[PDB]
Design a protein around this ligand. Structure first.
Ligand SMILES: CC(=O)N[C@H]1[C@H]([C@H](O)[C@H](O)COC(C)=O)O[C@@](O[C@@H]2[C@@H](O)[C@H](O)O[C@H](CO)[C@@H]2O)(C(=O)O)C[C@@H]1O
Ligand SMILES: CC(=O)N[C@H]1[C@H]([C@H](O)[C@H](O)COC(C)=O)O[C@@](O[C@@H]2[C@@H](O)[C@H](O)O[C@H](CO)[C@@H]2O)(C(=O)O)C[C@@H]1O
Ligand SMILES: CC(=O)N[C@H]1[C@H]([C@H](O)[C@H](O)COC(C)=O)O[C@@](O[C@@H]2[C@@H](O)[C@H](O)O[C@H](CO)[C@@H]2O)(C(=O)O)C[C@@H]1O
Ligand SMILES: *[C@@H]1O[C@H](CO)[C@@H](O[C@@H]2O[C@H](CO)[C@@H](O)[C@H](O)[C@H]2NC(C)=O)[C@H](O)[C@H]1NC(C)=O
Ligand SMILES: *[C@@H]1O[C@H](CO)[C@@H](O[C@@H]2O[C@H](CO)[C@@H](O)[C@H](O)[C@H]2NC(C)=O)[C@H](O)[C@H]1NC(C)=O
Ligand SMILES: *[C@@H]1O[C@H](CO)[C@@H](O[C@@H]2O[C@H](CO)[C@@H](O)[C@H](O)[C@H]2NC(C)=O)[C@H](O)[C@H]1NC(C)=O
Ligand SMILES: *[C@@H]1O[C@H](CO)[C@@H](O[C@@H]2O[C@H](CO)[C@@H](O)[C@H](O)[C@H]2NC(C)=O)[C@H](O)[C@H]1NC(C)=O
Ligand SMILES: *[C@@H]1O[C@H](CO)[C@@H](O[C@@H]2O[C@H](CO)[C@@H](O)[C@H](O)[C@H]2NC(C)=O)[C@H](O)[C@H]1NC(C)=O
Ligand SMILES: *[C@@H]1O[C@H](CO)[C@@H](O[C@@H]2O[C@H](CO)[C@@H](O)[C@H](O)[C@H]2NC(C)=O)[C@H](O)[C@H]1NC(C)=O
Ligand SMILES: *[C@@H]1O[C@H](CO)[C@@H](O)[C@H](O)[C@H]1NC(C)=O
Ligand SMILES: *[C@@H]1O[C@H](CO)[C@@H](O)[C@H](O)[C@H]1NC(C)=O
Ligand SMILES: *[C@@H]1O[C@H](CO)[C@@H](O)[C@H](O)[C@H]1NC(C)=O
Lengths: 149, 424, 149, 424, 149, 424
């Protein structure tokens, strides 16, 4: 339905990114492909995931100095310190997940933008990841050129 | 015609929340993990630590490196001599090796003690040297814990009042006597006609010794133990007493039988007890029964500039010899002391008692350059802030915390789809 | 002026989301309605607000273990600990407010996107929440169909 | 024609900043708030706490539950007997109930003491039992604070030197005497011709008692108080002295009038003082005037494995009887002690002195399963990290912090409009 | 290439924001100007930078109460506390940098949106910061009117 | 035709990462920085501090403000009198000014001491007043550190047993004697026929003095020092002894030569030593040789309600006079004490010894309203949480931390371009 929405599918049916088309005869009746050659997305995903190492290394590198002469574990204090560290880690996590989401979404916008400028101005944008093509201007091999499926 | 990129997820996809965007993914990976813990001894700072030992860390031993539990580079960081021990140097018994232990290091490794075990067979009227041993190392470890440096003080300034009293000798002590305490006896006191005169002495704990500042001294305030006053009156008039006073006259040690009950073991005969005490520098007085006088002649000098929790290494013989676990129990009851213990017997490469494979494994960490935490559980590197199980105290450095693996948050991996807004 | 901008109004004049139209005779002279049936927005607002509970519960659930044998309050230490906790709470607040803002803005984009695909390709997007309709293609009941006011 | 969704705000809208987007709204709601604080006693761990008490927590009392300040389930966690008190068991006065208090629990509740108040009318030459009471519970609370367990030791190993000395009896003590200390008298010392011989005794504090490890002992080092030496020479030759020594001869307690001034109250007559001291396990000596010898015969055994700050509950009678506030003042001056106090008089349901509505309210928290913090201000649940007013120490657990309500940040609510960029 | 992308240039060549044009004769051959009168961007940058003071003052205002009677510096503890504070400062930094980025990007969208509504509906949006103008509808002085370069 | 805004960066642009968007920029600016540190004395709370001083902070001095090291408003916060010192008031030597120092303040400034330096030339058999000085201020600073208030107690309740003993006078003490200790002598003891009777006395440390609660007392337990017993037997029979006991008989101070060695300096003659001790409130006993008795007659009363680390200001004369650095060394060895020291000599505006430009600069901070941290390195305002170099302890307040300038993160400035997505 176009890059602003994520939909669910039951049973089998692969998840991911697919090409979708709508009308024709009036009224038409849907259609969704079985995924194109979006190797850009796969490559971007790879880069974004590897980029998380920076934030993780920052956390791993930080360990508080301590000195205990006591002979019996102070279990409650030990656990409190861990709980606080886990709390910090949870915030960093929420920051990282959002940082992935926003940068992937942007990378997807950047994919759709290349498509728009490929068939320009044949494309006609209808919100991110959606286009209106007048099946008069464009045959089937032109749409094949513009959307590459 | 409307052509759209469409985003869809499966039942296999789970939603991960973010501050400013969510993520759908099928797989997750933990964000971080646990750091391994290695048993044995190590240091967080290779440029500020000191070891005290015996043959097993003595690079000058004829059988080095077969006789060593550490490699050369680590041995250079030790102050060791074959046959030596802190306790041996404290008392200086006849015929034993007498090493002047001294050094500085915020981190300290004590790998010594075995050279005065029950196997040594040192008598010298000792009531129970194993007890004396435990008590001595307890005082050492407590003082060392808050000190940067340590040195034997091999001779205290001493002065006795008597002019007739002479140096003591015993058949039970190789027909000689300890270096410390010194033994002074009056030959004329005989419980016939003569009772003699009460003996007096002073000993001084210095404010320094060589380049080492002294804020605290470990000394033995020894006294003789008789089983009853009747048994004592075989040697001296009245009850036994040997009392220790500071400069003002405050009783700080000794045994006074004018007020305290006798506790000598039945028909054991005369015994000597030598409890160790931590004393400030200064001049101290002694009052004793006429015939016998004991005077401290050595100490261990410490500062109070501070140090890290210390490490004490198990110091026992091979199975064939008679050992004790006094330094273990001294360490266990002393704050800021970390004990390193073998799980298998000591089997040496040089001879029976020097060069053990397990101990070499346990002491191997003393040569590492990347240890950030030292604990009673072992030592770690600075991989993550977490460990699977607690690091038991005492401990110091950048020490990891225990958390359940389930509380370590995850990150999305594999095929990933972004999500934002309500999508409805 | 279209979803990228927020404007101010004086005196009375209700605040919120409204329909706005521009030219006609050349030159025209503005017009702003008095709010349509954007019950989607009201519903999304409700969901987004309730979604903040997760972050709040995380904070409330975290309380440091302590043990004091002392008989007199250490007021300065007590206050310092509170100040640090309030600091953390302030960062979480700033994260939550932004998380609401971004997800509401996206929900608004998702509302505008449905409108675009309702009159497609009659709509013609002019940035988010804005459209160009040629009052030739569309009567008044078509615009009524497309924009629902 | 250009058709646009338009976003507008009023003067009623205020801007809330975010990291990655701002928000306009008319209403705000606080993000979190304060957790209520409940006065009274409670515990953070129902599986590791112990109570010590009297009739008011004794489920075996004939009038249970009317005589109880706690429900059955809480009473099962108490070690209590009707008529008992720690102090009563410490001394064991004639005809009083003598309960062997013992138990383990990191959290400890002391709800006992009233059974030896001024109302009891116990004499036994007591100089001031209220003073002795305060001093006794002070030592108990201090020792209990760092111990996991506690047990009465109902009989110390004791030995007196005299063969002629016999057990002491007094008209002021029901023609009998305390269980502790024991009283030994020499009938032949008469200030005519006879002065007698100085009396001696030893008492041992064990390293354990039953299943309980002993690291510390609370004992009384009692002595008799005379007003002057002239008044004492009515019984004994020379001044009065009763001195306590450890194994080596260090004076640790007692009253010696060879050096200390007499402080007996004018014409009061002979009085006994019984200060409590915390002593290590071992064997201790006693030296006294020939005619009278006092020897400790009981103790309270503690470990040093650690514990939480303790809770002490006000132990007073109904208005009709004579009470004291000794356990209150003992608690107030002792680190790590939390005192629970009623604001209205004690009015019992069973009889006058057992089963009080207010106390039941204050002790009701002892049965809760969701208490995370215990303090001198009361106890809390784990709702928020904040409280409106300080939780006064002593305290332990997940304890809330005080902050002003104004420093609690808010979140936007009601009609909401997002804002980003400069919009200009 | 239009507001979703940032490109690199070698040697000299000024960096920043410029006007770019594409085809004409078939096939055309690029062209990039030398920056227009985007004083809005310069002004927005100024405002956004000054807006960071709030977050910085929050950090500067927070200093933990301490009390040490000890006479010798506890260097390792001192350093650990600093390291933890620097860690917090690093997270705030990452939040601020992103807050600038997102709000500048939005301000740029708001600039492009004004251009779209200036030549409406002559503009025809092709993703953010890009337009399709039919050099039939628009002379050179109209494009001069719409894009102001 | 396609018309686009194009974003481009140079080699001069560097990428700055963000959580939710990156930024290209050419310039960076540090996010924050270091707070200046000012040497000298100050306070974090102008409404809760107290100063104790002499002429240099005495607003009633005839030459004020030329004679003052502080302005009027700061002087009002001091308790000072020209010619006074804590030590002078402790002993009360003949002809010296005797100010009753008293006040309350959680923060404390001690700017006094110079008025009893070697320049004073006070004899009174003093063995070494500089030593006594250092010892006295050590006890004061330790007690003051944990107290809210301080007051001189100008007269202890005292009672001597002797009826023949009379007040002591010495040619070396202006033919008079100290206010404290009091000196009592028996004229009849002559080592012919007479040895006299052992002297006795009691002194009481009160639980309060005026409005001030006393939990702790600094007192001097003085004794006379002879070089040997032969030298002492010129005055008294047997050895010298002057012993101090608490209520029970525990020796707490004094000099007993029955057990301790003499340490009088060769042919120096009789000397008096006056070590200061911190004692609880109560009644204390004294036993001494028949001819001479010393009894404490003054104290300094402290509470234990707590206080901040104290500030001690260097108290020395101008170069022309003979000074000491006893209060400096007292401060250096005492926990929780901060010492303020000049780098140039004292040159006064009024006369030589009052009104110094450097000291006025160093004490100027005592009038500031914006100091948040006070340390041994100086004081700071609340600009940033960081300082370039460590703030040395002791310290208290909102104290800055040291970090390297390189670890302070930066923010993008100048021309800025946003970046998001992979752009590939
Ligand atoms: C200094 C001294 O007294 N040396 C003689 C010792 C010593 O006096 C006794 O041990 C006293 O013991 C103490 C320390 O109280 O005795 C020596 O001979 C002993 C002898 O006294 C004892 O009856 O029998 C022993 C034989 O088993 C022994 O020979 C000694 O101990 O060697 C001689 C010392 O010269
Ligand atoms: C053990 C013992 O001495 N018992 C007798 C006591 C006791 O000796 C005296 O109290 C001594 O007091 C102390 C502890 O110093 O005296 C008894 O009789 C007393 C009598 O001595 C006293 O003159 O008058 C009392 C009458 O009011 C009393 O009867 C006693 O106290 O009961 C007899 C004990 O057997
Ligand atoms: C109270 C008292 O004894 N006063 C006389 C003192 C004093 O007795 C002696 O100092 C004893 O010293 C102590 C404290 O042990 O002596 C006075 O005369 C002395 C004289 O005893 C000494 O031989 O010579 C001194 C002359 O240099 C001096 O005159 C004194 O010290 O003034 C007289 C006191 O009355
Ligand atoms: C939902 O969709 C995902 C991806 O579209 C499916 O994941 C694939 O599963 C097969 C077999 O388990 C793997 O070999 C593939 O590698 C997976 N995909 C990818 C991209 O790695 C998943 O099986 C689907 N689930 C259901 C229930 O249909
Ligand atoms: C930011 O806000 C979003 C939207 O309100 C939150 O997303 C919700 O996350 C929960 C899981 O925690 C899901 O069950 C909801 O369905 C999500 N809502 C929507 C509309 O997608 C997100 O949790 C918030 N971020 C953080 C870190 O709390
Ligand atoms: C600004 O606009 C808001 C909303 O457009 C107005 O809020 C309404 O106020 C009335 C009366 O106070 C309430 O009954 C409504 O419920 C409010 N709106 C909503 C959506 O709840 C506000 O009164 C306006 N302020 C001014 C000064 O005109
Ligand atoms: C993120 O940046 C924005 C934009 O610079 C900040 O928004 C400003 O917020 C203040 C209130 O704190 C307003 O007075 C300004 O008008 C806002 N500027 C704009 C352009 O709207 C926002 O404060 C920053 N976020 C945080 C958490 O500091
Ligand atoms: C890269 O581009 C930037 C900006 O386009 C150049 O920065 C200018 O440098 C000159 C001389 O150093 C300054 O006078 C200008 O003020 C700078 N620009 C701005 C906007 O302030 C930079 O010199 C370029 N670098 C290279 C290697 O070409
Ligand atoms: C958020 O994610 C982005 C994208 O993955 C990260 O940007 C990378 O930052 C590093 C520098 O730290 C650059 O070398 C990479 O080129 C950047 N990647 C892209 C695609 O631009 C960014 O670091 C993350 N934010 C944080 C705070 O870690
Ligand atoms: C992936 O991250 C690691 C950091 O651990 C980095 O060293 C590596 O260069 C990164 N790879 C890419 C392709 O960016
Ligand atoms: C609202 O939040 C609460 C969390 O307190 C949750 O239990 C509830 O299910 C949420 N409601 C909706 C409709 O999401
Ligand atoms: C810039 O920030 C400062 C905060 O230090 C503020 O006082 C000032 O008003 C701001 N200026 C503008 C134009 O917003």
């Amino acid at each position: 339905f176009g890059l602003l929405f994520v939909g669910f599918v039951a049973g089998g049916v692969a998840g991911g990114y697919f090409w979708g088309r709508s009308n024709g005869g009036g009224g038409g009746a849907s259609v969704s492909s079985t995924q194109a050659g979006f190797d850009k997305i796969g490559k971007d995903i790879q880069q974004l995931r590897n980029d998380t190492n920076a934030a993780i290394e920052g956390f791993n590198g930080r360990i508080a100095h301590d000195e205990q002469a006591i002979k019996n574990l102070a279990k409650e204090i030990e656990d409190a310190r861990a709980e606080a560290l886990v709390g910090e880690l949870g915030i960093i996590r929420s920051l990282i997940v959002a940082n992935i989401s926003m940068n992937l979404k942007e990378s997807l916008y950047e994919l759709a933008n290349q498509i728009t400028k490929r068939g320009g101005g044949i494309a006609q944008e209808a919100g991110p990841g959606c286009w209106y093509v007048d099946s008069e201007n464009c045959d089937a091999s032109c749409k094949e050129y513009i959307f590459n499926f | 015609e409307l052509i759209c990129i469409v985003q869809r997820v499966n039942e296999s996809f789970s939603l991960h929340s973010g501050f400013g965007g969510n993520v759908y993914s099928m797989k997750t990976e933990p964000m971080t993990g646990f750091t391994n813990v290695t048993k044995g001894a190590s240091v967080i700072n290779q440029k500020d630590w000191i070891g005290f030992g015996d043959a097993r860390t003595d690079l000058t031993n004829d059988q080095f490196p077969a006789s060593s539990d550490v490699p050369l580079a680590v041995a250079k960081k030790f102050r060791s001599l074959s046959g030596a021990s802190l306790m041996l140097s404290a008392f200086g018994p006849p015929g034993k090796v007498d090493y002047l232990y001294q050094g500085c290091g915020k981190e300290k490794v004590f790998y010594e003690g075995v050279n005065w075990s029950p196997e040594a067979g040192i008598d010298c009227f000792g009531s129970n040297w194993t007890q004396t041993k435990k008590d001595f190392y307890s005082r050492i470890y407590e003082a060392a814990r808050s000190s940067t440096c340590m040195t034997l003080v091999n001779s205290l300034d001493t002065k006795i009042s008597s002019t007739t009293a002479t140096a003591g000798t015993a058949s039970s002590c190789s027909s000689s006597w300890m270096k410390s305490p010194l033994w002074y006896a009056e030959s004329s006191v005989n419980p016939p006609q003569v009772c003699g005169t009460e003996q007096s002495a002073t000993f001084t704990l210095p404010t320094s010794f060589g380049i080492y500042k002294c804020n605290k001294h470990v000394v033995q305030l020894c006294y003789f133990v008789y089983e009853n006053k009747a048994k004592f009156n075989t040697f001296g008039c009245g009850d036994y007493y040997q009392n220790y006073y500071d400069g003002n006259g405050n009783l700080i040690g000794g045994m006074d039988n004018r007020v305290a009950a006798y506790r000598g073991i039945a028909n054991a005969g005369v015994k000597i007890e030598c409890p160790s005490k931590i004393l400030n520098p200064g001049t101290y007085s002694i009052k004793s029964t006429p015939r016998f006088l004991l005077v401290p002649k050595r100490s261990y000098c410490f500062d109070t500039d501070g140090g890290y929790p210390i490490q004490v290494v198990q110091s026992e013989w091979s199975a064939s010899r008679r050992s004790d676990n006094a330094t273990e129990e001294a360490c266990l009851q002393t704050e800021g002391c970390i004990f390193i213990k073998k799980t298998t017997p000591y089997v040496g490469e040089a001879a029976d008692n020097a060069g053990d494979i397990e101990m070499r494994q346990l002491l191997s960490g003393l040569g590492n350059n990347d240890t950030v935490c030292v604990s009673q559980s072992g030592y770690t590197k600075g991989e993550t802030p977490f460990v699977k199980d607690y690091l038991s105290p005492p401990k110091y450095g950048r020490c990891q915390l225990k958390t359940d693996s389930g509380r370590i948050p995850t990150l999305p991996s594999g095929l990933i789809i972004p999500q934002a807004g309500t999508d409805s």
